[PDB]
Amino acid sequence: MRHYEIVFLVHPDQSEQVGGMVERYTKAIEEDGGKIHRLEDWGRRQLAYAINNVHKAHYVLMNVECSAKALAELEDNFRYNDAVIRNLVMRRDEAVTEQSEMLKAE
Amino acid sequence: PAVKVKENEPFDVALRRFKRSCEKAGVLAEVRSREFYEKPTAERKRKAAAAVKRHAKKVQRE
Amino acid sequence: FTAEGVKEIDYKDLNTLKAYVSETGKIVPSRITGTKAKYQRQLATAIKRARYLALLPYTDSH
Amino acid sequence: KVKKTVVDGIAHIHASFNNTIVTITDRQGNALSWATSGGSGFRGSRKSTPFAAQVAAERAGQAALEYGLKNLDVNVKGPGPGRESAVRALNACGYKIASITDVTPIPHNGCRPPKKRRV
RNA sequence: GAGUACGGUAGAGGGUGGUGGAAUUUCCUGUGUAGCGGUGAAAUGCGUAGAUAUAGGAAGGAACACCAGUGGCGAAGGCGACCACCUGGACUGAUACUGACACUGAGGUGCGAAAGCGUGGGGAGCAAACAGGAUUAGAUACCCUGGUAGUCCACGCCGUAAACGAUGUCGACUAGCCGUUGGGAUCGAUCUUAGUGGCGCAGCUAACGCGAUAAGUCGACCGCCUGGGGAGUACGGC
Numbered sequence A: 001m002r003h004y005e006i007v008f009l010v011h012p013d014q015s016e017q018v019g020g021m022v023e024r025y026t027k028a029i030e031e032d033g034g035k036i037h038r039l040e041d042w043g044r045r046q047l048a049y050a051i052n053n054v055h056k057a058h059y060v061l062m063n064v065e066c067s068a069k070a071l072a073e074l075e076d077n078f079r080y081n082d083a084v085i086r087n088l089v090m091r092r093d094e095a096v097t098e099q100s101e102m103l104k105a106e
Numbered sequence B: 001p002a003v004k005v006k007e008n009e010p011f012d013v014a015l016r017r018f019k020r021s022c023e024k025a026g027v028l029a030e031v032r033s034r035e036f037y038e039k040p041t042a043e044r045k046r047k048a049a050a051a052v053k054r055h056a057k058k059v060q061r062e
Numbered sequence C: 001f002t003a004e005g006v007k008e009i010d011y012k013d014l015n016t017l018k019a020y021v022s023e024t025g026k027i028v029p030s031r032i033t034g035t036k037a038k039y040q041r042q043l044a045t046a047i048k049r050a051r052y053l054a055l056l057p058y059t060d061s062h
Numbered sequence D: 001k002v003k004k005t006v007v008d009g010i011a012h013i014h015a016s017f018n019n020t021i022v023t024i025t026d027r028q029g030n031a032l033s034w035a036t037s038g039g040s041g042f043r044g045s046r047k048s049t050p051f052a053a054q055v056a057a058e059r060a061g062q063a064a065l066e067y068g069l070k071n072l073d074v075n076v077k078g079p080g081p082g083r084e085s086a087v088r089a090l091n092a093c094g095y096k097i098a099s100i101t102d103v104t105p106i107p108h109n110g111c112r113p114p115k116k117r118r119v
Numbered sequence E: 001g002a003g004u005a006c007g008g009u010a011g012a013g014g015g016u017g018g019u020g021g022a023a024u025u026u027c028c029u030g031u032g033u034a035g036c037g038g039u040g041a042a043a044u045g046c047g048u049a050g051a052u053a054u055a056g057g058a059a060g061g062a063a064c065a066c067c068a069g070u071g072g073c074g075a076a077g078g079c080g081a082c083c084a085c086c087u088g089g090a091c092u093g094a095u096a097c098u099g100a101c102a103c104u105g106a107g108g109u110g111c112g113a114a115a116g117c118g119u120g121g122g123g124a125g126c127a128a129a130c131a132g133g134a135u136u137a138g139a140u141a142c143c144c145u146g147g148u149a150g151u152c153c154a155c156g157c158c159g160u161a162a163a164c165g166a167u168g169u170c171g172a173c174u175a176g177c178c179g180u181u182g183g184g185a186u187c188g189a190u191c192u193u194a195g196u197g198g199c200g201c202a203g204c205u206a207a208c209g210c211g212a213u214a215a216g217u218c219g220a221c222c223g224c225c226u227g228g229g230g231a232g233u234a235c236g237g238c
């Protein structure tokens, strides 16, 4: 009904709770009747520039079918989280499920 | 912007490569285009003159 | 582009987006690449969005 | 009567239209020797010429040779003349030019520049 | 003719929040020492009470390089960082529907660059007024060093511009050629729409020049002109 393709990258020093964080973030989509369409993790990346005196971060993307309340709660948790460091939301008028780039190399 | 020196290259390829990279980046043009404030009327006037000259040059080939 | 490959582009094909940036980290004008205007607009917005996520550098120096 | 050694430093060129300033530091950015075209004895229009830049750069390099400094990263900043003259002046002193970079600052939009001159 | 219903397309159209990177300035700290800055040449100014340069950290305000285009959108004024939310219009294709419901418009009603005014915030850069240094016969200027209102934000007022295409709105006709922005068809080519540019036949014009985006051929309605000054001034009204 209102699609949202979110890309979120998290601090490296505590980049082990990324599981815990993603499966505690996606607890609101299903209760709202929304379907998860993609959840891709390709973390341990190198930044193009130093964000708050770090050079690496753990990336992730997920596609969400949510409403105003769930979305606003998501950005509330993002803003008040000390590991958010960056975030983006990218509404689309269609649903995408077929990967982003994976590792085309070996 | 930055230049690589390698294979004990002589100190003639180094400067030429540095100059070529600098003009590719156009550092001098940008820094020259900011030594004084250039008001939007002059913006539009200069761009219109550039457009008319560019079209005249394009037509003049035929 | 036109015939078969990718009717639309996004901030995912980092190879294609990297193919359309100068070595100093600036978008290449459409008069050089010879592309269409609509695709040029999509390309510029894709590059800026990808640049915000630190996938691409704002400047080559940083 | 204090002595210390250093190897593989960095030399900065600040080449503005009026004057060019050459300085030498380590990788930590601590001044070792500096020289100015104004100090080289020009004091006027000559101060802007590339030859004054050459003289100042070679003088600073010869002053800094007391510490060894078998390697240099030279970085330039400014659009004034003598942008490349000081590079050759330093190469004449007998250093190893490890790399050459420009650090000319380019504002994206930034503050507005001063009013246009009417001369 | 005008409008409605249904899929799509593009866009700096408008409003409310949040978030980015470059750069300037200021403060703190390390190294280091005699100049920095500026000019046509200088000087004022900043420096051994340790400056400029150089490295690290911090604060804050404003504008949004490259894309960028005879490019786009808007009734005009105007509108360029990115994202979310609210919202107007225009193009585009087929079918169905209403059945003249249209055009213009004295008065009236709103929107309306910049500068300016009121109340309260904010203040990095720039910079009327102003101070000092030059130039000069003089220089209440051009040039240089500083610098306050203002420029920014919220709410309210003000009603003006070479607010210009110096060209009112609406409709219908009239040889062609070369581009370009959106969209369609038929087989890179041909055709067709709605814009945006360059030439040009008739025709028009005092001439310049306009020439399907008329200043040509015609219709409908409105506004305005009647020698130069005095003067868009005086008096009166609002």
Ligand SMILES: [Mg+2]
Binding pocket: D114
């Ligand atoms: Mg100046």
Ligand SMILES: [Mg+2]
Binding pocket: none
């Ligand atoms: Mg300093």
Ligand SMILES: [Mg+2]
Binding pocket: none
């Ligand atoms: Mg610093």
Ligand SMILES: [Mg+2]
Binding pocket: none
């Ligand atoms: Mg306009």
Ligand SMILES: [Mg+2]
Binding pocket: none
């Ligand atoms: Mg104003």
Ligand SMILES: [Mg+2]
Binding pocket: E116
């Ligand atoms: Mg005011």
Ligand SMILES: [Mg+2]
Binding pocket: none
């Ligand atoms: Mg005010």
Ligand SMILES: [Mg+2]
Binding pocket: none
């Ligand atoms: Mg006030």
Ligand SMILES: [Mg+2]
Binding pocket: none
């Ligand atoms: Mg100030």
Ligand SMILES: [Mg+2]
Binding pocket: none
């Ligand atoms: Mg002044």
Ligand SMILES: [Mg+2]
Binding pocket: none
């Ligand atoms: Mg000043």
Ligand SMILES: [Mg+2]
Binding pocket: E147
């Ligand atoms: Mg000031």
Ligand SMILES: [Mg+2]
Binding pocket: none
């Ligand atoms: Mg006043």
Ligand SMILES: [Mg+2]
Binding pocket: E153
């Ligand atoms: Mg305001």
Ligand SMILES: [Mg+2]
Binding pocket: none
């Ligand atoms: Mg205008």
Ligand SMILES: [Mg+2]
Binding pocket: none
């Ligand atoms: Mg008029």
